[PDB]
Design an enzyme around this catalytic site. Structure first.
Site, PDB file in Angstrom:
ATOM      1  N   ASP A  50       0.115 -10.954   3.128  1.00 22.32           N
ATOM      2  CA  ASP A  50      -0.745  -9.774   3.113  1.00 22.32           C
ATOM      3  C   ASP A  50      -1.527  -9.613   1.809  1.00 22.32           C
ATOM      4  O   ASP A  50      -1.566  -8.528   1.221  1.00 22.32           O
ATOM      5  CB  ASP A  50       0.045  -8.516   3.449  1.00 22.32           C
ATOM      6  CG  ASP A  50       0.380  -8.436   4.915  1.00 22.32           C
ATOM      7  OD1 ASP A  50       1.198  -7.576   5.301  1.00 22.32           O
ATOM      8  OD2 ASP A  50      -0.174  -9.252   5.683  1.00 22.32           O
ATOM      9  N   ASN A  85       1.512 -10.544   8.235  1.00 20.49           N
ATOM     10  CA  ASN A  85       1.116 -10.180   9.588  1.00 20.49           C
ATOM     11  C   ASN A  85      -0.387  -9.930   9.696  1.00 20.49           C
ATOM     12  O   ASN A  85      -1.000 -10.261  10.710  1.00 20.49           O
ATOM     13  CB  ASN A  85       1.915  -8.976  10.099  1.00 20.49           C
ATOM     14  CG  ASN A  85       1.973  -7.833   9.097  1.00 20.49           C
ATOM     15  OD1 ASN A  85       2.363  -8.016   7.944  1.00 20.49           O
ATOM     16  ND2 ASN A  85       1.615  -6.634   9.550  1.00 20.49           N
ATOM     17  N   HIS A  86      -0.980  -9.393   8.630  1.00 26.30           N
ATOM     18  CA  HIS A  86      -2.402  -9.048   8.619  1.00 26.30           C
ATOM     19  C   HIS A  86      -3.329 -10.242   8.447  1.00 26.30           C
ATOM     20  O   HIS A  86      -4.531 -10.127   8.648  1.00 26.30           O
ATOM     21  CB  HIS A  86      -2.701  -8.051   7.504  1.00 26.30           C
ATOM     22  CG  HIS A  86      -2.140  -6.690   7.748  1.00 26.30           C
ATOM     23  ND1 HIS A  86      -2.056  -6.137   9.006  1.00 26.30           N
ATOM     24  CD2 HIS A  86      -1.656  -5.759   6.892  1.00 26.30           C
ATOM     25  CE1 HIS A  86      -1.533  -4.927   8.917  1.00 26.30           C
ATOM     26  NE2 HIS A  86      -1.282  -4.673   7.645  1.00 26.30           N
ATOM     27  N   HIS A 189       7.530  -2.937   1.271  1.00 30.11           N
ATOM     28  CA  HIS A 189       6.703  -2.416   0.191  1.00 30.11           C
ATOM     29  C   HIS A 189       7.475  -1.964  -1.041  1.00 30.11           C
ATOM     30  O   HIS A 189       6.913  -1.904  -2.137  1.00 30.11           O
ATOM     31  CB  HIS A 189       5.816  -1.286   0.706  1.00 30.11           C
ATOM     32  CG  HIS A 189       4.781  -1.736   1.685  1.00 30.11           C
ATOM     33  ND1 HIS A 189       3.720  -0.946   2.068  1.00 30.11           N
ATOM     34  CD2 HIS A 189       4.639  -2.906   2.355  1.00 30.11           C
ATOM     35  CE1 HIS A 189       2.974  -1.605   2.936  1.00 30.11           C
ATOM     36  NE2 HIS A 189       3.510  -2.799   3.126  1.00 30.11           N
TER      37      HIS A 189
END
Lengths: 313, 307, 306, 317, 305, 314
Positions: A50, A85-86, A189
């Site tokens: 990411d 994932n992004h 995060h």
DNA sequence: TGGCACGTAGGAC
DNA sequence: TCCTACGTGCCAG
């Protein structure tokens, strides 16, 4: 003789609350990390995914990113990354934004053994797999342990959520991943560094505040990245520095009386730069609070029109 | 003694009818042009904008673009580009997809003087301004006139709609632009070449079919790009080669009887590559034609019970 | 069975026009309510001066309505009598208590409450002036009659009774009939004692309304009563005093260094920042202004007598 | 008429105003308000916009709060959505003091920003803010330019304000007519006279006070009539043509200028023709006042200046 | 009784649906039918609330019937009052209203007038159809009727408007606009509306024939015609109003989606007293069927959904 | 005198709104009322009306009011009135009624024979509605039938609303040799006065009671518009026993402004007007702003503005 | 720093 | 019981 850097989730091009400054903020923190990593001159950089917040990112983001990793590659700093994932394409043939980095960065979906000065150390990793294909992932995983059996220093890079570390939702259970020296992880995060499976596991955590949630994890743990040395035979928590990163400040408020009001103003006053204020404000105070709209970046607080008999014991 | 290339409106990353194949087509035709341009080895390349179909284009597109223009700069071909409507930022500080090419390409919003063998020639240009800022544009243009006073060979690059050439809406009236040798224009998808103001004006036109409209302009005039020489002191139509490019052909149908059906089938037979079919077909005939769905790319036809 | 006797919260009192003093009254009130909510009595008797004025601050009305709402939502039955401060003066002027009509029973007569598992009698009436005492006596003599055939009978009143407050009073101690519990209001100090084959109470103010009650709060403690009335009989032994933390007042007499140090000592041991009052010699006033951080408000006279 | 949507614009009822310290006057204010409320109820509008100064004071009389809460409860119980902005009288003055409007939080939406009300079957944007003083006009502008922005992609947009706007109230105003962005309807408050006229590609309105707050508004009530507006807002466009003004019968003021038998008999008759004992004001010649003092019973209160000058003033036509 | 009167409105004379002789006839005969019954009743007064004619310049035949009707009514010492409907209101200045042709039989009302009945005194006022645009104008007109009627025992108001609760879009008056009168003789609305209101009783006499595709079944439940009020006693309630119904052309709905609705539709048409207008839905598969059976019916026309 | 007299009138064209002007519509109404006023002053025995009373099949209400108010005065003064349907009063659709039908209570609508018994004598009347050329054949039999029923009558009157051949060239429905021998020919369709001896008797078109077209402006100047008054006292009828009662009506001035003479000639023509006239004709572009000075003196300017320069020098 | 409004205390019928 | 004057807390510019 040797050191390397674990970083992840910069989320390049994130535009929180559709604000110009927040998109800038994300960019600034990223660059700030980069400026230090160049100051540090590590032998390797592990990026846990990411890097970009979206599959088709802002042009400004790719600009910043490409200039960043180019600057690293030009300073003999080796870099590895796994797809978050992004950054994983959805249509067949759609390319990853990470593909724009092929000249500065090694994208990992298998094993590789890096001969560093002056040694030899093993890396494996793979892109983000979904919950749906965990069985798929396990086969991959047992195979990584297999090719790493005969290596002293072995690193696993992944971008997934692990079960104890993130209740719901996870793709992996903490007992799924084999024995490795360092677990260079990403998807989460908040900072997570603790001894694990006869070794040491880490989530570098996001390089800026992505949600109203992580406001104080930056207060207590601090956001940024880890710097592992890995010189000696052992690796413990003691040989891992957490480099923190200054980022856009969030002050929470709960203005219900004269005390809480002044407590809110003072918190906002000692902010170096205009903060995102959030939480709750009793209606009666809101027009009074509107006096700080200049001293505040954006007010995201719920206005309560109820009179509560809430009393502390 | 000298030659150069005029191309524009490739619209990279255009995904017509949300078809995978259509996004490919646009990609291929751009690439095809680039390969031909490299075969040619021209001294300069002028790109008049709408290189990308969006502000935030597909990643494959940005790779193709960067690799293509890299290959050009590495063969010492100078390249100029102006921002099309699609490459123009909306927010203050949002950057252009063209910004990713600043190392291979000179993005033009002003004057520059290019030295060729064995002479000296003046180039100016500016990004797509909206109709709203027509008056603005005039100051810019009247100033380019001024900076070009003492130059023999002068080229202007623009990406706009011009008045006779695109009725509504246009941003400039054809009497707006000063005297220049070559008018490297962009915003229009059909080929437009005609003598103009003691010189010669051109729209390179889209390098593929962006609309169901241009289906036959590719058939009758042919799509691709221009190759202007500018060898001599003067330039006329006689020194401009137009290179055509194989691209997706469209078949129109109006099947209401046996004649229109079979004759339509024949047109498809005579298509080199699987065509996009559109028009009208009577409901009775649609299951009949769906047996032939293998030789066609996508069926975009109206179902008629009337005529 | 259990019930709560409370009165004289004086909501919206703003002593010395200070934000914090208006709050003090509010908080202690909020605290009693919080305590009343853990206790869960079947009934709460409020003897008046809930509000300090007929047109009380908006905040007060919101707190008050929210409070009795919370009580009514916990199936706690509530009765109230109008205090002197809640009595209208112009014809057609309304009482702030009217804002509570959906949570509270305003009393001007008799009512018999069926509790689990019993049946018990209450009567009461609003604040009367001294002037209309005769008027009042029939009310009581008629209350006497309507309560004759009841085991457990409670009288609610908001008046001053003669022995309990020398001057001025509206009723004489021989005026009130035999009732089990005398839930009274008008007086600010706690008064609980056996009386006329039963037991009489003034709940007293839930905060310090005058520099007067500063130490009656020390020795008796301010708050409210919790009467159980579980048994057939009731004595002092089944009455709990729930106390309330409230703003402290320190008295001073600075005329030399001796009084100065002991005064400071009294102020330092204060849990909450105190109101200081009394006398200070002029020569000491700049000296006393050094202590401004540990103090709420200085209400002391500066005398240069000597 | 209809509709897919309708709303009511009302403002300045000034609940608990006690003009001339008269009991009858405090009632008058209450009654006019109740009447508006009653009428709003037969109408059954989809929305009510109340532009402030609902209560005449920061700490209102109890009866006023009682009436207000019972009123808005009644609206709210009939699924009539209600919005309000704080008037100048409803703005707290000490920090932590609450507005009397806060006693209405369950029946009324207090507005200090944007909201999208979803009606059957449509979508319309509402914005508004409490009363700001001149002092902080800049502050107000940022907000307004921001309202312009959040309403751009909206068809029907309403602004609620309780301010004085420059042309409409010369001295003093807090805003200039060029400060407010383009909105369909400008639900305004601070002014007591009815003002309805087209403005900035839309339509601006002051519902005006629902009773006579000053001896000043005596005739603006006669010709324009006091009460509230009922805007339908059915179509995409809105003109004055889709606004009914509902008037409200209230305490009458008769002006007198008694200088001869013409004026005296006309004054008595104007007073005799009164439904309720009227407020009489104007001028009376000394020579006539003891004669006029017989009507103190037919009159609520006499507020007339007694002139002892003899005018030889003669009219032409 | 000793005294009685009639409330009637919205005949829409000359409405010629689909340009048919037969439709306008239904309107003409039914109108006269009311008049015949009104001749049986012999009331002291007749109140007509407007839209007598469907247009400002009506067919001549309509004007023939109208005068012929009111002639016989006026010749029997029957007092008659009328107000202008929306369809009878001039647009050009100097254009005359068709009601003007009746000035010898009827009092056109734009103010007050007092009727002497046996043996008493009763007040009448009324006004023409005002547009929504000029409501304010109307209120003052009305506030003034209230004033002139205060000292009168029995008072009747005549109007041709749509009132807000009674008709959502569009109305010109809110029901709280009209002052207190004994009987509210109202017009603009085509359905029967009778109910107590503002310490008295309000009525829309309703159309005397079906003017829209809507009232096909509203006529079924309430019945179309006119009201007959007596007003002998001091008070007036619903109990002192007889409603006389009027026979008119029937409308039948169909929904052929199977044989079930198909045969039931055919049969329901059969029980019709007068040749009916058939409408509704028929499946394409079924369409040739009734067009073979079309001979027993006057007009065949159905909605295709 | 007299001992016996009657009235011939026609073509009032009630409700005609020329140039869509109120004043012109009024003018038609007023002139009609004035005719009725004069006719009531005279107190004649009979009124024969030859059709086109109303200008349309569906006339304005204002017209029907005036017509009905007028004929009431006639019928209330025991003057019997006869009328035949003009082109404007004949129905088109089957079952549509004629605007004349609203008068069946004051007036006899004629489509056949009737004999009016006057004091103290006996005279025969027949008539029929307006027929087109198409049904001339139709008309001839009708007429052969009227002549037949009138043979044994001394005094016989024919009422018609048609165009007759010499009197109106194209188009006409009947030829002047079509109509049989009658004492008086009460005719209608024509707007100009036509009175002359004819077929051992006397033929008349009463003519329009106002200016229906820009055309008749001067036929009114020299012949005068209005109605005829027939006495028919004696056995014979000649011109000498027919008075033409004129009717003052709205003036029309023709202009042709091409030079200063013609300009001044036009202005004076307008000045000499009692009432603001309808001005028509031609005005050169060059002159028009000067001519715009009389707009106050003018009812309506209906003149063509010619911007051509003509060498018209005859 | 002026107001401004609340609260505190002395007084009048 | 009213009201007055006065002192004063607290936001103002």
């Amino acid at each position: 003789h040797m050191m390397f850097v674990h970083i992840a989730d910069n989320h390049l091009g994130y535009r929180q609350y559709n604000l110009d400054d927040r998109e800038k903020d994300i960019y600034d923190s990223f660059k700030l990390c980069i400026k230090k990593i160049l100051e540090i001159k590590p032998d390797v950089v592990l990026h846990s995914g990411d890097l970009f917040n979206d599959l088709r990112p802002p042009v400004k983001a790719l600009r910043i990113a490409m200039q960043a990793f180019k600057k690293l590659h030009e300073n003999n700093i080796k870099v590895y990354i796994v797809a978050g994932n992004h950054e994983m394409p959805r249509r067949l043939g759609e390319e990853s934004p990470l593909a724009l980095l092929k000249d500065y960065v090694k994208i990992l979906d298998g094993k590789d053994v890096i001969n560093v000065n002056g040694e030899e150390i093993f890396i494996c990793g793979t892109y983000y797999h979904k919950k749906s294909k965990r069985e798929e992932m396990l086969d991959k995983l047992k195979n990584f342990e297999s090719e790493a059996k005969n290596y002293k220093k072995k690193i696993l890079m992944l971008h997934q959520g692990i079960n104890p570390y993130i209740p719901l939702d996870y793709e992996l259970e903490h007992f799924d991943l084999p024995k490795f020296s360092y677990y260079a992880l990403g998807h989460i995060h908040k900072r997570i560094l603790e001894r694990f499976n006869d070794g040491i596991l880490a989530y570098s955590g996001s390089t800026e505040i992505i949600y109203r949630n992580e406001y104080e994890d930056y207060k207590k743990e601090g956001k940024g990245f880890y710097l592992v040395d890995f010189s000696g035979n052992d690796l413990d928590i003691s040989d891992i520095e957490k480099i923190d990163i200054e980022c856009r400040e969030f002050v929470e408020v709960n203005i219900k009386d004269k005390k809480s009001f002044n407590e809110a103003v003072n918190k906002i006053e000692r902010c170096k730069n205009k903060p995102v204020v959030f939480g709750k404000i009793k209606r009666e105070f809101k027009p009074w609070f509107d006096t700080l709209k200049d001293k505040i970046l954006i007010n995201k607080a719920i206005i309560v029109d109820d009179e509560f008999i809430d009393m502390p014991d």
